[PDB]
Amino acid sequence: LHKEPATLIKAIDGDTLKLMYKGQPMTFRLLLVDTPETKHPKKGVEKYGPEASAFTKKMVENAKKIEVEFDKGQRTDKYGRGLAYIYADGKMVNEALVRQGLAKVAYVYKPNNTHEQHLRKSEAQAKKEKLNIWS
């Protein structure tokens, strides 16, 4: 895998961002993580949804450099959203969320599961530390 540059257009949710990628505006879904959501009327605004959403927003808005890293399988989902690992100043946003107890590791689909181990270790630590969702 390799990272490629991207430019923030807009943070939409904890797990969804609008980026300029290869000169086109595109919606990205963060690979392998589920955050509580602010949108979706199925539940509305879940608990920690605003926090997850604010965390992603600050992290990407305050970055010098944003990079996207596609995994080895499908690069878009059925909604046309890019499926990627997002990095803010070299720090993976998907992991940061999980490390802070603001996201769970998603149901995984090989072969898009390169960082699965890594994220699960972070999730286990946030649970051990009883952070946010785990409190």
mmCIF file of C-alpha atoms in Angstrom:
data_model
loop_
_atom_site.group_PDB
_atom_site.id
_atom_site.type_symbol
_atom_site.label_atom_id
_atom_site.label_comp_id
_atom_site.label_asym_id
_atom_site.label_seq_id
_atom_site.Cartn_x
_atom_site.Cartn_y
_atom_site.Cartn_z
ATOM 1 C CA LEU A 1 0.000 0.000 0.000
ATOM 2 C CA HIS A 2 0.973 3.618 -0.471
ATOM 3 C CA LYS A 3 -0.313 6.994 0.605
ATOM 4 C CA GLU A 4 -1.486 9.687 -1.784
ATOM 5 C CA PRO A 5 -2.169 13.345 -1.133
ATOM 6 C CA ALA A 6 -5.656 14.744 -0.806
ATOM 7 C CA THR A 7 -7.159 18.049 0.249
ATOM 8 C CA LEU A 8 -9.918 18.454 2.806
ATOM 9 C CA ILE A 9 -13.157 19.753 1.399
ATOM 10 C CA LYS A 10 -15.422 19.085 4.364
ATOM 11 C CA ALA A 11 -15.734 16.790 7.374
ATOM 12 C CA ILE A 12 -19.267 15.302 7.320
ATOM 13 C CA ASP A 13 -19.343 12.834 10.174
ATOM 14 C CA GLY A 14 -17.039 10.902 12.464
ATOM 15 C CA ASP A 15 -16.469 8.326 9.716
ATOM 16 C CA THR A 16 -17.118 10.333 6.531
ATOM 17 C CA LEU A 17 -15.154 13.111 4.863
ATOM 18 C CA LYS A 18 -15.378 15.017 1.586
ATOM 19 C CA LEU A 19 -11.910 15.264 0.013
ATOM 20 C CA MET A 20 -10.393 16.552 -3.221
ATOM 21 C CA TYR A 21 -8.616 13.504 -4.600
ATOM 22 C CA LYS A 22 -6.779 13.519 -7.928
ATOM 23 C CA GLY A 23 -8.542 16.785 -8.649
ATOM 24 C CA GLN A 24 -12.069 15.553 -8.027
ATOM 25 C CA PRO A 25 -14.365 16.079 -5.046
ATOM 26 C CA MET A 26 -15.131 12.711 -3.488
ATOM 27 C CA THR A 27 -16.757 11.283 -0.375
ATOM 28 C CA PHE A 28 -14.565 8.957 1.660
ATOM 29 C CA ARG A 29 -15.722 6.423 4.258
ATOM 30 C CA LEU A 30 -13.046 5.535 6.859
ATOM 31 C CA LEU A 31 -12.101 1.867 6.444
ATOM 32 C CA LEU A 32 -12.616 -0.633 9.312
ATOM 33 C CA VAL A 33 -14.254 1.712 11.812
ATOM 34 C CA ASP A 34 -17.761 2.459 12.959
ATOM 35 C CA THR A 35 -18.438 5.712 14.820
ATOM 36 C CA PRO A 36 -21.723 6.647 16.469
ATOM 37 C CA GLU A 37 -23.500 8.818 13.914
ATOM 38 C CA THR A 38 -25.037 12.280 13.941
ATOM 39 C CA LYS A 39 -26.935 11.818 10.679
ATOM 40 C CA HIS A 40 -29.125 8.759 9.917
ATOM 41 C CA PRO A 41 -32.692 9.043 11.251
ATOM 42 C CA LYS A 42 -32.739 5.330 12.005
ATOM 43 C CA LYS A 43 -31.436 6.403 15.408
ATOM 44 C CA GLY A 44 -30.705 10.095 14.835
ATOM 45 C CA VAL A 45 -27.814 11.333 16.963
ATOM 46 C CA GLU A 46 -26.227 8.451 18.836
ATOM 47 C CA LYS A 47 -24.279 8.994 22.070
ATOM 48 C CA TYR A 48 -20.684 10.093 21.389
ATOM 49 C CA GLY A 49 -21.765 10.895 17.824
ATOM 50 C CA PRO A 50 -21.177 14.625 18.185
ATOM 51 C CA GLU A 51 -17.872 13.913 19.952
ATOM 52 C CA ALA A 52 -16.625 11.442 17.323
ATOM 53 C CA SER A 53 -17.647 13.924 14.689
ATOM 54 C CA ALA A 54 -15.869 16.812 16.420
ATOM 55 C CA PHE A 55 -12.772 14.710 16.932
ATOM 56 C CA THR A 56 -12.509 13.812 13.250
ATOM 57 C CA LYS A 57 -13.220 17.377 12.235
ATOM 58 C CA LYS A 58 -10.532 18.959 14.427
ATOM 59 C CA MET A 59 -7.953 16.415 13.508
ATOM 60 C CA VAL A 60 -8.395 16.900 9.780
ATOM 61 C CA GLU A 61 -9.015 20.657 9.833
ATOM 62 C CA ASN A 62 -5.863 21.320 11.856
ATOM 63 C CA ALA A 63 -3.623 19.193 9.630
ATOM 64 C CA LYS A 64 -0.839 20.453 7.417
ATOM 65 C CA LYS A 65 -1.134 17.383 5.162
ATOM 66 C CA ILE A 66 -3.928 14.872 4.548
ATOM 67 C CA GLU A 67 -3.182 11.611 2.787
ATOM 68 C CA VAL A 68 -5.385 8.742 1.694
ATOM 69 C CA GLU A 69 -4.292 5.128 1.707
ATOM 70 C CA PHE A 70 -6.401 2.605 -0.234
ATOM 71 C CA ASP A 71 -6.369 -1.020 0.932
ATOM 72 C CA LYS A 72 -5.951 -4.067 -1.397
ATOM 73 C CA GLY A 73 -9.611 -4.807 -2.229
ATOM 74 C CA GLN A 74 -12.457 -2.684 -3.561
ATOM 75 C CA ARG A 75 -11.663 1.032 -3.357
ATOM 76 C CA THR A 76 -15.280 2.263 -3.462
ATOM 77 C CA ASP A 77 -18.453 1.039 -1.717
ATOM 78 C CA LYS A 78 -21.897 0.709 -3.316
ATOM 79 C CA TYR A 79 -22.616 4.383 -2.583
ATOM 80 C CA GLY A 80 -19.651 5.539 -4.601
ATOM 81 C CA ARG A 81 -17.705 6.402 -1.467
ATOM 82 C CA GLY A 82 -13.936 5.886 -1.404
ATOM 83 C CA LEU A 83 -12.783 3.291 1.114
ATOM 84 C CA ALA A 84 -9.559 4.345 2.762
ATOM 85 C CA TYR A 85 -7.282 4.846 5.727
ATOM 86 C CA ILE A 86 -6.969 8.577 6.253
ATOM 87 C CA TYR A 87 -3.777 10.197 7.644
ATOM 88 C CA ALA A 88 -3.596 13.659 9.273
ATOM 89 C CA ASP A 89 0.035 14.817 9.540
ATOM 90 C CA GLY A 90 1.177 11.216 9.327
ATOM 91 C CA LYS A 91 -1.347 10.066 11.982
ATOM 92 C CA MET A 92 -4.068 7.632 10.982
ATOM 93 C CA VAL A 93 -7.462 9.133 11.705
ATOM 94 C CA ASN A 94 -9.129 5.726 11.813
ATOM 95 C CA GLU A 95 -6.791 4.546 14.581
ATOM 96 C CA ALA A 96 -6.980 7.778 16.584
ATOM 97 C CA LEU A 97 -10.744 7.411 16.755
ATOM 98 C CA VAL A 98 -10.501 3.848 17.932
ATOM 99 C CA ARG A 99 -7.705 4.597 20.388
ATOM 100 C CA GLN A 100 -9.907 7.300 22.030
ATOM 101 C CA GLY A 101 -12.940 5.063 22.451
ATOM 102 C CA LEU A 102 -14.794 7.082 19.800
ATOM 103 C CA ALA A 103 -15.200 4.238 17.295
ATOM 104 C CA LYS A 104 -15.507 0.437 17.279
ATOM 105 C CA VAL A 105 -13.637 -1.763 14.801
ATOM 106 C CA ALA A 106 -16.186 -2.471 11.999
ATOM 107 C CA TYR A 107 -17.269 -5.814 10.581
ATOM 108 C CA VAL A 108 -14.269 -6.590 8.381
ATOM 109 C CA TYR A 109 -14.273 -7.664 4.715
ATOM 110 C CA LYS A 110 -11.167 -9.243 3.284
ATOM 111 C CA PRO A 111 -9.226 -8.406 1.491
ATOM 112 C CA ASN A 112 -9.732 -4.873 2.831
ATOM 113 C CA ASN A 113 -8.239 -5.635 6.243
ATOM 114 C CA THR A 114 -4.551 -4.723 6.213
ATOM 115 C CA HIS A 115 -4.624 -2.612 9.391
ATOM 116 C CA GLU A 116 -7.122 -4.853 11.219
ATOM 117 C CA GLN A 117 -4.644 -6.158 13.835
ATOM 118 C CA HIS A 118 -3.366 -2.683 14.560
ATOM 119 C CA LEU A 119 -6.787 -1.177 15.055
ATOM 120 C CA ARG A 120 -7.975 -4.066 17.183
ATOM 121 C CA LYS A 121 -5.047 -3.585 19.581
ATOM 122 C CA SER A 122 -5.947 0.067 19.854
ATOM 123 C CA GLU A 123 -9.533 -0.880 20.490
ATOM 124 C CA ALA A 124 -8.574 -3.303 23.239
ATOM 125 C CA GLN A 125 -6.527 -0.550 24.930
ATOM 126 C CA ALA A 126 -9.350 1.973 24.769
ATOM 127 C CA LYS A 127 -11.667 -0.666 26.313
ATOM 128 C CA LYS A 128 -9.106 -1.431 29.009
ATOM 129 C CA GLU A 129 -8.928 2.314 29.656
ATOM 130 C CA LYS A 130 -12.741 2.514 29.637
ATOM 131 C CA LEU A 131 -12.717 5.522 27.315
ATOM 132 C CA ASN A 132 -15.893 7.133 25.921
ATOM 133 C CA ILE A 133 -18.012 4.363 24.333
ATOM 134 C CA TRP A 134 -16.363 1.859 26.677
ATOM 135 C CA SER A 135 -17.258 3.838 29.801
#
